[PDB]
């Protein structure tokens, strides 16, 4: 078939794990004696057919269904008023359903009772076994919403008493009635009334999730520029973290309930700062700690100028920077977006602490000096490995001067060089250059330099070694050739 | 289904069109564009979309009617006072509220012990008992009548509650 809805169950394999402890305890002989029967042929199943025919009635609106409505209306009109039934004809079915659920008892099938505890237990076991992961998740959701309140409020004595009622055995019920402790401690309905408040809170949380998730998901997926998580949380009253987690959970369940692998970039995109903070790997038995400050430095409340500098930096800084803001405008291609946000995202965010529009530096190449040996030695310098050389000496290797020493604009850079295994001479990439200094593990997710204030407070004001340096850079081909240089005077054309 | 070199390549099987993911992708595709959604931006430098009126207009333009037309209908987990108290002490009560693939479960261990269902339910019972003591002392409002509580009701007071509106014990007392 192709539907395999709850009426005709998908056939299942044998040797499958049983949902309940007594069925983990099944003897294999009795397991085998079990017969493969439809769901409705179960005594409890057949009684539930008797119960659910009314659920069919409310929709399948046949002439027979109208006749059954008439009969059930007549039966329900046993109420003295009758007017309530008249107005509730559209929902008299739920009254009969509630009363039918109440009037269910366990005994012998051949006797006047519909089904026994064993049949009910078997139906539960196999109904659970017949559930996919989605079905099991929905069952656990139902448990959370319905049973946890009542179960939390109820005492263990009350639960054992309800177990005795389910077993419906007169002898054990009589023993419990004999027991004094069981009689006295059951009657606390005023206390039990807290159960509806507990249920209401759990249900309002589940309602937040399942109903307010799709709406804000649609808004954020449509225009994350218009409705980013902070605005979304502020205008819906929820938490920043709760809204972000709702979005992540909804996308991941949409991926998981289908058979599409989720995009792991979403938690990284919505939790960039938290991803850098809290997502370390750990080993066994080491009880790692938490670092509160990145570095040890003087606080900014200690000076008027530090306070002003921090205030200016905060005003120039974001508060929550997202995958759409200016700092990420350098991800101009979808492949750049995917490679930056999918994997090596930690590498990319760690390549530089500050936030810029590059995440790196362009590479370039150098010319190889003429080898007067010629092709006798052109084979050299080609190897199996990249050879990296970093300069040292005075004027190089100082941590305090790191940002100035590996700045492309500095006449005195550190001059790193890489020889490729094919003999090519190239410059170093920003990460290779940065790997020759002391480690620097921190990031700044909110300061974006281009939005600094200007023109109110920030209004910046103002030997022949420079000539000698320009001479050094200047080409010197004129030495071989006020006798000013002129274009050639053509002779062949005359 | 053909690469540059011309040979055949593996194509993932199409996802079921009835899936929520398929609906989401389809809805993103044929719905209206972002730049056609609003013609003018907010009055004060800010993009339109904060107020529930603009939000609802945008949602309708996108082809979906909000179940939360006004700020009063959306729930607010700040008001709940018992769920946070129970959550803070021993753990989450709505275990499986944030579950995926059957993982990330926060339920007690199945091995009956100092970390199992009996102890966890006993401690939750203690916390709700503390809140009920608050109710009795009058700091908290009296809870409404519940089905579990209604299920006992002397076996005769259920009839009175049913014949009356009887949402609260105060209402039943007035009745």
């Amino acid at each position: 078939a192709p539907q395999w809805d709850l009426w005709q169950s998908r056939p299942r394999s044998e040797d499958m794990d049983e949902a309940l402890q007594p069925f983990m305890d099944m003897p294999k002989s009795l397991k085998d004696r079990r017969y493969d029967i439809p769901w409705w042929a179960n005594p409890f199943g057949a009684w539930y057919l008797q119960n659910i025919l009314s659920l069919e009635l409310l929709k399948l609106k046949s002439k027979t269904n109208a006749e059954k409505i008439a009969t059930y209306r007549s039966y329900m009109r046993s109420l003295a008023s009758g007017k309530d039934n008249t107005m509730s004809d559209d929902d008299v079915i739920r009254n009969i359903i509630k009363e039918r659920w109440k009037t269910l008892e366990f005994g012998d099938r051949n006797a006047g009772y519909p089904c026994t505890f064993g049949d009910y237990i078997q139906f539960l076991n196999e109904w659970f076994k017949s559930l996919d992961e989605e079905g099991m998740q929905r069952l656990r959701e139902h448990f959370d919403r319905r049973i946890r309140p009542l179960l939390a409020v109820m005492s263990p004595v009350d639960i054992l008493w309800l177990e005795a009622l389910t077993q419906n055995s007169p002898h054990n019920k009589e023993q419990l009635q004999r027991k004094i402790a069981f009689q006295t401690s059951l009657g606390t309905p005023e206390f039990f009334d807290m159960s509806k408040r507990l249920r209401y809170e759990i249900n309002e949380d589940y309602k937040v999730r399942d109903e307010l998730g799709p709406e804000l998901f649609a808004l954020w997926s449509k225009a994350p520029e218009r409705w980013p998580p902070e605005r979304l949380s502020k205008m819906y009253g929820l938490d920043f973290t709760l809204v972000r987690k709702i979005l992540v959970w909804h996308h991941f369940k949409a991926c998981y309930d289908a058979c599409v692998e989720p995009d792991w970039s979403l938690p990284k995109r919505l939790f960039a700062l938290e991803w850098i903070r809290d997502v370390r790997a750990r080993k066994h038995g080491l009880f790692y700690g938490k670092m509160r400050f990145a570095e040890q430095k003087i606080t900014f409340y200690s000076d008027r100028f530090l306070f002003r500098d921090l205030v200016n930096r905060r005003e120039a800084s974001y508060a929550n920077v997202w995958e759409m803001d200016d700092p990420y405008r350098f991800l101009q291609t979808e492949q750049d977006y995917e490679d930056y946000w999918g994997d090596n995202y930690d590498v990319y965010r760690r390549m530089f602490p500050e936030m810029i529009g590059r995440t790196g530096e362009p590479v370039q190449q150098y010319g190889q000096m003429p080898i007067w040996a010629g092709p006798h030695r052109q084979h050299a310098n080609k190897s199996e490995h990249n050879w990296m050389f970093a300069e040292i000496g005075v004027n190089v290797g100082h941590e305090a001067l790191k940002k100035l020493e590996l700045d492309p604009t500095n006449e005195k850079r550190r001059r790193f060089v890489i020889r490729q295994p094919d003999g090519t001479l190239r410059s170093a990439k920003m990460s290779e250059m940065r790997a020759w200094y002391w480690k620097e593990e921190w990031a700044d997710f909110r300061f974006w330099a281009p939005q600094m204030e200007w023109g109110i407070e920030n209004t910046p004001s103002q030997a022949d070694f420079r000539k000698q340096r320009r001479i050094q850079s200047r080409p010197v081909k004129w030495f071989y050739e006020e006798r000013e240089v002129r274009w050639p005077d053509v002779i062949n054309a005359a | 289904d053909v690469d540059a070199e011309g040979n055949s390549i593996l194509e993932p099987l199409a996802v079921s069109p009835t899936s929520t993911l398929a609906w989401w992708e389809k809805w993103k595709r044929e719905t209206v564009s972002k730049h056609e959604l609003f013609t003018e931006e907010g009055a004060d430098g800010t993009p339109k979309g904060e107020t529930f009126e603009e939000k609802n207009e945008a949602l309708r333009m996108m082809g979906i009617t909000s179940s939360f037309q006004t700020k009063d209908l959306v729930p607010q987990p700040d008001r709940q006072k018992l769920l946070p108290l129970i959550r803070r002490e021993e753990g989450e009560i709505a275990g499986s509220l944030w579950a995926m693939d059957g993982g990330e479960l926060s339920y007690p261990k199945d091995g009956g012990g100092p970390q199992g269902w009996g102890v966890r339910l006993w401690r939750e019972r203690q916390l709700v008992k503390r809140e009920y003591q608050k109710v009795l002392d009058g700091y908290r409002p009296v809870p409404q009548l519940s089905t579990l509580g209604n299920s006992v009701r002397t076996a005769g007071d259920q009839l009175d509650i049913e014949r009356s509106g009887a949402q609260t014990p105060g209402e039943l007392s007035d009745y």
Binding site: Q21, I97, I121, R146, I147, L162 | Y107, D110, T147, S151
Partner: peptide, 28 residues
């Protein structure tokens, strides 16, 4: 070894319909 939470299911063997009045059905 991760537990499969079979006590969830064991808690369903009780007759919650007696108290909840159709607790297994949709919420009203």
């Amino acid at each position: 070894e991760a537990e499969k939470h079979h006590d969830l299911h064991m808690f369903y063997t009780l007759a919650w319909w007696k108290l909840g009045e159709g607790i297994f059905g949709v919420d009203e």
